[PDB]
């Protein structure tokens, strides 16, 4: 089973936003954790959109991770709508044009975000 990861962002006009997104893609690609890692973007005219990204991916299952702190309409409506998935909060399983796709929850409430905030002070590393 070839496993893909698409990292989906939005806050995308801010300086160095794509570059930080690409740093995570690079780190995760080098770790071997997934067969393929791509970055994509919600909303209007920033390429690729998550649907293009998934189409281009040569994986049997693709995991879609929203790099959002918030849990608003980009996540509960825009993104699912784009991929033809159910709206609302939470994990969603399904297929996008024949391929298995799982929309994961946004990273916002993850204990790792709490710890990233702590580490900005602690600087253990």
CATH number at residue 52: 3.40.50.1400
Query: How far apart are the C-alpha atoms of 1 and 6, rounded to whole Å?
Result: 16
The boundaries of the domain holding residue 100 are 1-125
Catalytic positions are: 10
Residue whose structure tokens are 């080098």: 30
Query: How far apart are the C-alpha atoms of 36 and 53, rounded to whole Å?
Result: 11
* Count of structural domains within the chain: 1
What Rg, from alpha-carbon coordinates, does the chain have?
14
Listed residue (82, 66, 69, 60) closest to 6, CA to CA: 66
Helix (H, G, I), strand (E, B) or coil at 81: helix
Binding residues for substrate: 46, 69-74
Q: What is the resolution of this structure in A?
A: 2.0
Where do the H-state alpha helices sit in the chain? Answer: 17-31, 50-56, 73, 79-83, 111-122
Binding residues for Co(2+): 10, 74
Tokens (6 digits) for 98? 């024949």
Query: Edge to edge, what strands does the sheet with 36-41 contain?
Result: 36-41, 3-9, 61-66, 99-103, 92-96
């Amino acid at each position: 089973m070839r496993r893909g990861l698409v990292i989906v962002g939005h806050g995308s006009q801010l300086n160095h936003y794509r570059e930080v997104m690409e740093l995570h893609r690079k780190r995760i690609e080098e770790s071997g954790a997934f067969d393929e890692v791509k970055i994509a973007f919600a909303a209007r005219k920033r390429r690729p959109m998550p649907d293009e990204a998934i189409r281009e991916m040569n994986c049997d299952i693709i995991y879609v991770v929203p790099l959002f702190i918030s849990y608003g309409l980009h996540v509960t409506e825009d993104l699912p709508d784009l991929l033809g998935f159910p709206r609302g909060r939470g994990i969603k399983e399904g297929e996008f044009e024949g391929k298995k796709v799982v929309i994961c929850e946004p990273i916002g409430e993850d204990y790792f975000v709490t710890y990233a905030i702590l580490n900005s002070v602690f600087r253990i590393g």
